[PDB]
Amino acid sequence: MWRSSGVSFTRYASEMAALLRQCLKEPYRTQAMQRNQIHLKETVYQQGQVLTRETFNDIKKAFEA
Template sequence: MASNAAVPFLRAAGRTYITYSNICANLVRNCLKEPYNTEAIYREKVHFSISKWTDGKPEKPTVRSDSPEE
């Protein structure tokens, strides 16, 4: 959980806590040696599905797989 004292400094720098957290996570991943680096990059991928709703009912979901590298 973020400290409330850090929020004004992040906002002044034009960042949110999420962007700060992502920057820190990328730095840690880049410092890892093999095979941990490869494992961390694999876990970084995001999988999600998108469903459009028509007349109050969901249509067939579209599965997406995105990663920050793509």
């Protein structure tokens, strides 16, 4: 399925584990969403001369862009 939609297995697994984490109980759900915080800052280059810089705080937008 993911191979046909042009999708990686890592993306599928992460985006499904996100839903599974949403199906948790609150005391454990807090710790689960705590240990899975995401923050990145991608910086694209082309022989120096930075093309763009972009932050990511969500798994979906991190995999899409």
